[PDB]
Design a protein around this ligand. Structure first.
Ligand SMILES: CC(=O)NC[C@H](Cc1ccc(OCCc2nc(-c3ccccc3)oc2C)cc1)Nc1ccccc1C(=O)c1ccccc1
Lengths: 255, 247
């Protein structure tokens, strides 16, 4: 079965590259200055970068994150279809799996695009500093800090895209999502994905003790990030009466 | 290339096809021949503003067609040389090839009176499909038209496994980056397909040619299916995640 686990791992990695244009290997190539990004760290550079790469600074930064999230949901959906068993599950659950999964997966892969100092934007054409993202006005104060704090700790695991491909498959196939109708089909798929992640982790990181365990523990951090963000969204929703949330994201958010 | 190698290629493709496609032509034909539950009627579908039946049947086809795409994708990975192709080209070959393959294989579930549904457990008649209000009665009928002509060739699963591989490795899909290796592989599969058909159907003259002529007909069906599929976004309009799964 060992070889069947390796074939699973090879397969998901294949679909991962096919579904997400900006990989972790590409992000790190751009980040670790070998493709150099334009750097947005203030108002004038944000607007200079609207020319050069791509008060209302917060809204532009809002919609730019909405754009990429909608886009991200679409990639994640593409990828889910490739996971063996997914498209054979009950449709209502396939939807439930995505509704809940995409949040968690988005911060996982957002880590790939982050370092200590900032975050890659516009498929790596841009780089926005962590500081500039703290500077925004205060329904949006430090909305990004907890994602940077997670990235810092998650990135020190030193996962690569082939590790990530399996980890996010495991995330999608969570049997504890609320409202799932048939938990057992989902859990059996996850079991095989977990088996494959275990082998992959040991093979790709032989001198990295309990990497499997340590990666699963990061779900605690992931979910707590999810929760605070929904709380920030609502504060906005009450006070940004004229602002707009995309219908795909609307659907993903309504608990 | 040697007949042994083409026989080996032939047999290799049949193996993968049997692993990737649970409901085979042969199985489908066993079921078809004189049970599964028959849907001939509005009350038999019912007994077998939220949503009109025609849309729910449309929806269910999209679900099943998404399952077909994953079976076909997995089968492609087994074609010698496919996974060594450039990755963008594997996506492009699949993107354009899956519809043609879906309608090819749908013929395996069809006779002139209906189609097998739900893993062979059901049978929706042809006439019931036609009953459906515009443009919903007009989506399956062309497929039945093709199926009946197609099934007259009496291909089996072993034949189909190679024909399917030939469709995927089409060098003329828009946006291919490196056509040569795709045509190279397709030539090999055609080589194999031609020997398969002479050996499997020795009394069936120019089957090879006749089969290739049907690749033409499948492109017409795919093209016009789109022109029905756009008369649908048009007059038939939401739950975004769902729409995203079937983009
Ligand atoms: C599932 C899901 O929707 N999850 C919530 C989702 C998670 C997220 C967060 C950051 C991120 O950065 C990508 C890199 C990024 N790209 C830009 C960019 C690009 C072009 C122009 C300007 C800026 O800025 C950043 C930080 C990607 C995804 N967040 C949002 C999703 C929808 C709408 C808004 C948000 C916000 O984060 C937000 C930001 C400011 C004010 C209000 C809200």
């Amino acid at each position: 079965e060992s070889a069947d686990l390796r074939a699973l791992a090879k397969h998901l990695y294949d679909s991962y590259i096919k579904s997400f244009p900006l990989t972790k290997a590409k992000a790190r190539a751009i980040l670790t200055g070998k493709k150099s990004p334009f750097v947005i760290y203030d108002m004038n550079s944000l607007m200079m970068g609207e020319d050069k790469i791509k008060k209302e600074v917060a809204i532009r930064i809002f919609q730019g994150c909405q754009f990429r999230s909608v886009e991200a949901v679409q990639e994640i959906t593409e990828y889910a279809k490739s996971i063996p068993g997914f498209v054979n599950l009950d449709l209502n659950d396939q939807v439930t799996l995505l509704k809940y999964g995409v949040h968690e997966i988005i911060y996982t892969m957002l880590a790939s695009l982050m370092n200590k100092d900032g975050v890659l934007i516009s498929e790596g054409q841009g780089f926005m500093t962590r500081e500039f993202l703290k500077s925004l006005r205060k329904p949006f104060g430090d909305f990004m800090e907890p994602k940077f704090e997670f990235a810092v700790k998650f990135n020190a695991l030193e996962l690569d895209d082939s590790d990530l491909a399996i980890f996010i498959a495991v995330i999608i196939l969570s049997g504890d999502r609320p409202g799932l109708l048939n938990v057992k089909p989902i859990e059996d798929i996850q079991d095989n994905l977990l088996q494959a992640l275990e082998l992959q982790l040991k093979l790709n990181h032989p001198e990295s003790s309990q990497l499997f365990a340590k990666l699963l523990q990061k779900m605690t951090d992931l979910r707590q990030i999810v929760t605070e963000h929904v709380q920030l969204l609502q504060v906005i929703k009450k006070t940004e009466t004229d602002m707009s949330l995309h219908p795909l994201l609307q659907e993903i958010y309504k608990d």
